[PDB]
C-alpha cells in the first residue's frame, strides 16, 4: 500500500493523539463557555486606527499601567442594533473568551460604556495577509502551504468544538511577529453540531450550498479553505466577476480553472476541496480532516511542528518595535465620543 508498516503505525498513533488532544480541549472550552476581565477606557492611550468596519473600528492602544500595546475593537452599540448584529457581537465575545489555540487571537479585556462595546485583544503587528498577498502578488506553494496548514489545524480545533467559522479570507488573517497566522474575527461563527441555514460570508468564499439556500454544515469551511489556498497560490481567487451574482454562477457550476504553474498535487487537493458534491468533498467524508492532512500536497508538513510554532516561517514582517503600525494602512481617525446617556442597555446586558 502507500505506507509501509512503520509509517502506518506512526500515522495511526498521531491521529489517535489528535483525538486525545481535542477531547481535552473541548472539555476546557465547555468549562470556560459556561463559567466565563474588565478594564475601562481610561486605562489605555489610543494610538492609531488599524482597520475599519460598519460596527466601529479597531485601534492600536497602549495600556497605561503596564505599557503593553493591544488592539481594541470598538463597537457602536446603536450601529450594532441598526445593522441587526446584536447576537453576532455577543457571540463573538463569548467565543473569544472561551477558545484557546496558538492561531486564535487572545482576548485580554472587555468592557462597555454608555455608547460603545470594547474588546481588547493581543496586537498582531504583522498586518493582514491580504496586504502582503496583493503586494507580493502570489505566494509560492511552500509559503501558501505553511499558512494553509495553520488554517487546517485551526479548523480541526474549531470543528471539534462544533464551531463553524464561515468567513475565511485573507482580510481576516493577520501575520504575527514570528510570521504565523492569527484569526481575530468571529462575527459569523456559530455552534452547529447539525446544520444551519443563514446566508452569510463573503461572495468569493461562499460554498455552493450556501448560495443555493440549503441547510449546510462545517463542510462550508473546507470549501473556503480551497478558495484560500487557490487565492494564496494564484494571487486571485478561483471565482470572480464584476458582480456577486456572476460569482455565484461560477461557484455552483462545478468548473474551476487553474494557473499553469500550479502543481498537480495542488490541483488535486483543490478539486477535492472545491467539490460541489458534498458526498465527495474533503473534510466531509468518513475520514474527516485526515483526507486533507494526509493529502500528497501536505506530505512535507510536520503537523506537530506547525502547532508548536517550530517551523521557520517563509516571511517575517517588518517590525521596528512595540507599537509599530507600518504593516497597516492609514485610516481616517474619528474621536471616541461617549454619550452622557446610556444607549441600548438591555440589548447588551450580557456583554
Amino acid at each position: 500500500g502507500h505506507m509501509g508498516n512503520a509509517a502506518a503505525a506512526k500515522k495511526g498513533s498521531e491521529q489517535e493523539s489528535v483525538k486525545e488532544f481535542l477531547a481535552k480541549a473541548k472539555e476546557e472550552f465547555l468549562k470556560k463557555w459556561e463559567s466565563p476581565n474588565t478594564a475601562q477606557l481610561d486605562h489605555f492611550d489610543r494610538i492609531k486606527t488599524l482597520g475599519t468596519g460598519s460596527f466601529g473600528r479597531v485601534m492600536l492602544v497602549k495600556h497605561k499601567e503596564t505599557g503593553n500595546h493591544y488592539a481594541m475593537k470598538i463597537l457602536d452599540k446603536q450601529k450594532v442594533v441598526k445593522l441587526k448584529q446584536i447576537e453576532h457581537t455577543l457571540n463573538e465575545k463569548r467565543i473569544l473568551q472561551a477558545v484557546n489555540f496558538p492561531f486564535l487571537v487572545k482576548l485580554e479585556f472587555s468592557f462597555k460604556d454608555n455608547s460603545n462595546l470594547y474588546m481588547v485583544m493581543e496586537y498582531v503587528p504583522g498586518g493582514e495577509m491580504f496586504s502582503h498577498l496583493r503586494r507580493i502578488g502570489r505566494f509560492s506553494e511552500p509559503h501558501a502551504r505553511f499558512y494553509a496548514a495553520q488554517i487546517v489545524l485551526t479548523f480541526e480545533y474549531l470543528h471539534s468544538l462544533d464551531l463553524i467559522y464561515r468567513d475565511l479570507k485573507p482580510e481576516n488573517l493577520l501575520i504575527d511577529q514570528q510570521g504565523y497566522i492569527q484569526v481575530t474575527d468571529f462575527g459569523f461563527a456559530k455552534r452547529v453540531k447539525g446544520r444551519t441555514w443563514t446566508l452569510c460570508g463573503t461572495p468569493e468564499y461562499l460554498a455552493p450550498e450556501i448560495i443555493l439556500s440549503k441547510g449546510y454544515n462545517k463542510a462550508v469551511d473546507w470549501w473556503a479553505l480551497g478558495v484560500l489556498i487557490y487565492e494564496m497560490a494564484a494571487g486571485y481567487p478561483p471565482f470572480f466577476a464584476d458582480q456577486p451574482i456572476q460569482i455565484y454562477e461560477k461557484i455552483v457550476s462545478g468548473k474551476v480553472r487553474f494557473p499553469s504553474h500550479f502543481s498537480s498535487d495542488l490541483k488535486d487537493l483543490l478539486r477535492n476541496l472545491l467539490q460541489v458534491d458534498l458526498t465527495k468533498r474533503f473534510g466531509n467524508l468518513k475520514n474527516g480532516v485526515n483526507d486533507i492532512k494526509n493529502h500528497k500536497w501536505f506530505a512535507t508538513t510536520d503537523w506537530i511542528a506547525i502547532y508548536q510554532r517550530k517551523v521557520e516561517a517563509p516571511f517575517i514582517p517588518k517590525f521596528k518595535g512595540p507599537g509599530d503600525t507600518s504593516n497597516f494602512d492609514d485610516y481616517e481617525e474619528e474621536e471616541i465620543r461617549v454619550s452622557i446617556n446610556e444607549k441600548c442597555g438591555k440589548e447588551f446586558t450580557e456583554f
Binding site: 482580510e171 452569510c200 463573503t202 461572495p203 494564484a234 466577476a241 464584476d242
Partner: peptide, 18 residues
C-alpha cells in the same frame, strides 16, 4: 490573461461580507 480578468472585475480590494 486570467490575472487581467481579475483586475477587470474591480474586486481587487478588501471584500465585505454580505
Amino acid at each position: 490573461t486570467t490575472y487581467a480578468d481579475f483586475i477587470a472585475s474591480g474586486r481587487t480590494g478588501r471584500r465585505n461580507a454580505i
